[PDB]
Structure formats: C-alpha cells, structure tokens
C-alpha cells in the first residue's frame, strides 16, 4: 500500500490474500488426514488395552 496506488492495490493485495488463505487451506486439509491415521491408531490401541 505504501508503494503502489490504491486503484490496483486491491487487485495486488488480493492474490497475496489468496496465497496465504489457500496455504492455510492446504495445511488444514492435510492435518485432518494425519488425525485419521491417528484416530485409527487410537482405536487399535483401545482394543489392544
């Protein structure tokens, strides 16, 4: 914002916003996978005990 005019700043900042927002989406949709591989292990241990 401090180096570019505001007419295209919203367009300029949008692809920066979607970059972080998409990255957070990728992390969370992978973290859910790792939960499933742990939720499966939790049930296996529960049966083991």
């Amino acid at each position: 914002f401090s180096r570019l005019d505001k007419v295209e700043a919203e367009v300029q900042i949008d692809r920066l916003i979607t970059g972080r927002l998409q990255s957070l989406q990728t992390y969370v949709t992978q973290q859910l996978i790792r939960a499933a591989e742990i939720r499966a292990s939790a049930n296996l241990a529960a049966t083991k005990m």
């Binding site: 005019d5 505001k6 007419v7």
Partner: protein, 49 residues
Amino acid sequence: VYADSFVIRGDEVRQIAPGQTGNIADYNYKLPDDFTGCVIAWNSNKLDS
C-alpha cells in the same frame, strides 16, 4: 445522481482519477478509492480561455 464540475489545467487531468496524489488531487478535489461513477473532460479552450 449528483454531478460535480470545475475547471482545471490540462496538466492535472489524470489527477481526477482516484488514488492520484498531487497538489490539486490532495488539496482541491479528491475522489474516493472505491469511486462509483466516472468523469467527462475535454479541452474547452474556446470559451474558458
């Protein structure tokens, strides 16, 4: 709809655009960043001059 009119020199025609910085665009007439509408400008040298 409300229309605003004034007379400016040819060197500051581009300053009417939103996000433009200058002596006239910051001290005389500034448009909002998310400006709705548009402007009409022409060289009326015959009458004003």
